[PDB]
Write a protein that binds this ligand. Sequence first.
Ligand SMILES: NC(=O)c1ccc[n+]([C@@H]2O[C@H](COP(=O)([O-])OP(=O)(O)OC[C@H]3O[C@@H](n4cnc5c(N)ncnc54)[C@H](O)[C@@H]3O)[C@@H](O)[C@H]2O)c1
Ligand SMILES: NC(=O)c1ccc[n+]([C@@H]2O[C@H](COP(=O)([O-])OP(=O)(O)OC[C@H]3O[C@@H](n4cnc5c(N)ncnc54)[C@H](O)[C@@H]3O)[C@@H](O)[C@H]2O)c1
Ligand SMILES: O=c1ccn([C@@H]2O[C@H](COP(=O)(O)OP(=O)(O)O[C@@H]3O[C@@H](CO)[C@H](O)[C@@H](O)[C@H]3O)[C@@H](O)[C@H]2O)c(=O)[nH]1
Ligand SMILES: O=c1ccn([C@@H]2O[C@H](COP(=O)(O)OP(=O)(O)O[C@@H]3O[C@H](CO)[C@@H](O)[C@@H](O)[C@H]3O)[C@@H](O)[C@H]2O)c(=O)[nH]1
Lengths: 340, 339
Amino acid sequence: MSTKGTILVTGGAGYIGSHTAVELLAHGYDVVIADNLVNSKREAIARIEKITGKTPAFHETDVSDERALARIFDAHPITAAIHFAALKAVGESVAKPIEYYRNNLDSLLSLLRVMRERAVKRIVFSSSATVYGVPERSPIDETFPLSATNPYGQTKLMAEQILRDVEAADPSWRVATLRYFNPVGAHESGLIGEDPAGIPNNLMPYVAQVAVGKLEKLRVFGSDYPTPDGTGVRDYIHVVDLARGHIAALDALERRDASLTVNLGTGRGYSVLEVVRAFEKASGRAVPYELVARRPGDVAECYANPAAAAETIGWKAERDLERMCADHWRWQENNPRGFV
Amino acid sequence: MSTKGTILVTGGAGYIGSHTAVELLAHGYDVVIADNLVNSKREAIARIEKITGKTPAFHETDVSDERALARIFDAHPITAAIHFAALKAVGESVAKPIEYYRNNLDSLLSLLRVMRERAVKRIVFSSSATVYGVPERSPIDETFPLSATNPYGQTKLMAEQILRDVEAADPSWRVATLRYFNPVGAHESGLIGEDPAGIPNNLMPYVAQVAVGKLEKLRVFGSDYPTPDGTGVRDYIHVVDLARGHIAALDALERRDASLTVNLGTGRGYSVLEVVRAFEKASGRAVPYELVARRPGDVAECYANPAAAAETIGWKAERDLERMCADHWRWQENNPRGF
Ligand SMILES: NC(=O)c1ccc[n+]([C@@H]2O[C@H](COP(=O)([O-])OP(=O)(O)OC[C@H]3O[C@@H](n4cnc5c(N)ncnc54)[C@H](O)[C@@H]3O)[C@@H](O)[C@H]2O)c1
Ligand SMILES: NC(=O)c1ccc[n+]([C@@H]2O[C@H](COP(=O)([O-])OP(=O)(O)OC[C@H]3O[C@@H](n4cnc5c(N)ncnc54)[C@H](O)[C@@H]3O)[C@@H](O)[C@H]2O)c1
Ligand SMILES: O=c1ccn([C@@H]2O[C@H](COP(=O)(O)OP(=O)(O)O[C@@H]3O[C@@H](CO)[C@H](O)[C@@H](O)[C@H]3O)[C@@H](O)[C@H]2O)c(=O)[nH]1
Ligand SMILES: O=c1ccn([C@@H]2O[C@H](COP(=O)(O)OP(=O)(O)O[C@@H]3O[C@H](CO)[C@@H](O)[C@@H](O)[C@H]3O)[C@@H](O)[C@H]2O)c(=O)[nH]1
């Protein structure tokens, strides 16, 4: 077994967690994935093994079930946890706020209690730029005022508050909270990537499905924003860069003997139209679109100040927009219908 | 059936819940109480029946157990809920945040899930002046900035947010959020009242127990506050007035066909030493005290602007500090064993 660590990755069958499980295994950690497959497929776990040549432990477990979760700790000498498990569809969160609060807050609360009981005190938490609400300006740094405009954002704000209070009660806690911006792309092998259920809510999967022929036409949400081409601007970050950030975060908790909160982004914003043009160039496929009305709740612009992460955890985004598009496209083309 | 309504009162064996169940029953509502008795006794339910001559249904259930809660809805024609169920020890909330978040958030979320399932969409929620954090001034009105200094307060802020979101999801929801200040006193029968376990964290039960002689002397937390006598100033409100505010709230939800958020306070603050002095007069007993160091987290001064409640729900506090002390004292004397 590993002398580096044994990492419980909740939500590890999903998009970012699968990529993270890959990087952990590649760096010699032991990995235990807990995922109830509410938004992911079992075959993603097989593909993590096809990539790494290593078999992480897998438990098909609702992590809000403390009894079920404690049986995972019975079976494995967990040294730290990365908590990816959550529902994450904003539109759905507005429609079903109770389930979002229940799933997202109870899964965290359950983990925290089992960890406390088992004296495991190292946790990395998936937060979001959604905690910055309507930003006054970009680039956004960590000391910006926190608010949210949708229940999904609220679950992330409330999670961060819970984590602070848990450490306030037991100062032995070491928490890395990582506020991701807009992850896109896929492992360079093409063997894993994002596999949305149904019609994608997010930009790059929609673009990719237009490119492969699964969808007919991209809709661009709003063309009158206060941005150079009137379309929304976001900080797209390669999911492999994001996954490496998690190894950096764990090392930083160790070295610093202290909690940290840091943005994970590139610092460069791209408009919707810039993304489409980049994807067409990288893919060689057409992405026809139409300019339609703003989607309610969207901000004009949002991108990170990556400075804190560079200083605190020694991490920077490496892969550019072209590479994000190229790698997302390889996954889509080679897996036209997603996993199996 | 009551023609008025069948009200699910979660946490209804507790202090404010029991008083509110009494006012509901007396005003012709049917009442179903769900309480896991984590901070109250079954005897309280017998007392409600004694006071009122009516028999509320009672279910000894953890309201965060959605399955157990659904069985309650199965059995009763619930028209609205008033959610008092929570853990409320501020000090314990700092030491035990996971337990507070789990209890206070899951109980509400389970309730809201079941209510949506059964299409019951009227709720009154027990919030607190704690949501105002450290106020910039008093009287405090409802539009003051919200913040909290402990996990207990965080659970109230989070609850208020969850409730706004439930209505954003389904705009037929009607939510009366009521921010209580400092409830004190007891039903005038003396048959129910505040029954803390162990030594009381809050002012008046400690003063009442000092006056009766169960505790030797009152400790006063700080004497160097920017107040007239240097001790903390608070908006004390008679729990019977408070309970009455819940009936007003239910009615206003119907009238305005709109959600509301109001303070329930008197608008008048009294200092720690002013409470002591008034209790002495109503009880005819002495209350010895020692001036000690400030209690961390304690605010110098906090009292409500009662204007919005008066206008929005037609309610005002009637009972004065003298009445609060006399009623609290009657409970204390007649029930040395508590419940
Ligand atoms: N993708 C993004 O744009 C983005 C941006 C910021 C933050 N995040 C956060 O990052 C994390 C991962 O996002 P993702 O894109 O990988 O989404 P994802 O849906 O692919 O991954 C989440 C995984 O969690 C699982 N899960 C959900 N609830 C669970 C529960 N109760 N028990 C066990 N498993 C559960 C799902 O089945 C899924 O596999 C989430 O916390 C999300 O909120 C995502
Ligand atoms: N100073 C105050 O007393 C004050 C001020 C502002 C707000 N509040 C709020 O008013 C409400 C009632 O307060 P109170 O003074 O009557 O306290 P209380 O402890 O007497 O009443 C709360 C009741 O809820 C019950 N309960 C707790 N969790 C439960 C669960 N999961 N399922 C079923 N029952 C549960 C307890 O057994 C108790 O009987 C609480 O929500 C409290 O936070 C109180
Ligand atoms: O079909 C689409 C999808 C998106 N967009 C636009 O593309 C940009 C990116 O949107 P999307 O990929 O949906 O991400 P965001 O809305 O920036 O952020 C989503 O929502 C945030 C909460 O508001 C979450 O925190 C993130 O994880 C992310 O998924 C926005 O300007 C959208 O208006 C389109 O024009 N058409
Ligand atoms: O033994 C005591 C108890 C209280 N006080 C003082 O009396 C005042 C009232 O205190 P207490 O009765 O504890 O109420 P608060 O602290 O104002 O607030 C209570 O407790 C929470 C904050 O601590 C609030 O959110 C409410 O729930 C309320 O019950 C404060 O100035 C205290 O410093 C004393 O001097 N000695």
